[PDB]
Amino acid sequence: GPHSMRYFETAVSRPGLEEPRYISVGYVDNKEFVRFDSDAENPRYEPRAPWMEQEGPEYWERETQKAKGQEQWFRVSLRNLLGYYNQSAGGSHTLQQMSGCDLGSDWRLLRGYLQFAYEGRDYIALNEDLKTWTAADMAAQITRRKWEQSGAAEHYKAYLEGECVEWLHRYLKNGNATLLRTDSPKAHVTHHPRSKGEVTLRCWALGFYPADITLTWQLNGEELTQDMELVETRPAGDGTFQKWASVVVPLGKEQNYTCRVYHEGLPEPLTLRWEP
């Protein structure tokens, strides 16, 4: 088991809205686990998984305070971005941030992430070295300099190597039952006759976590990028996921067609075909 933590922050300005709305969402192993929202009647970080109600109110006060500081930081940053891009007033704008760390199965640090986006587009990001910055846009160079000048990278580096890691370990223990495993998928093939002499074999995969999964149809051993049909992986809404892949098939000549399904909770991949 390798692991991760992330914090996805967003601030949105809308043309007449007074102040931007700030929203921060924490993820441990891709599962939402805390959340702050400035629109809430009383803005505070709330827990979002059972295992987090294990945390004493001093924790929630500190975090909630950080949030209020972040809210102000996004405010000022949004304001400067307007100027950097020579945008006038009365438009909609978005500033986003992803921050966090990845751990090996040894629980050591693998990568730190620190990235920003403006209007949904990459604006500036801390490189893997955690010392240098990437920023494509001409307007973004102003920021790259201000932050090179001021040792911003060392600050974010410290968080990413210390606090991000230390606290992720702590969170990992405190719900060491909730996350330890993964829900394998259950598969089956459905039959749908369509045109004269042709059928749709649609291989489903249901009730799996996490979402990463691959589905492949084989003609006896030969895979198909030749007009196989799929859908983006989608949540069932119960905390598990669904995907299907289908292909065009001669009616009758249909046991030559094997769907394979690959997922991490699987001991080994599933081979299936149509069972009437």
């Binding site: 702050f36 975090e63 949030a67 972040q70 940053s77 990413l160």
Partner: peptide, 9 residues
């Protein structure tokens, strides 16, 4: 722990 940012953008 949420991170906290250095200087604004």
């Amino acid at each position: 722990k949420a991170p906290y940012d250095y200087a604004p953008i």
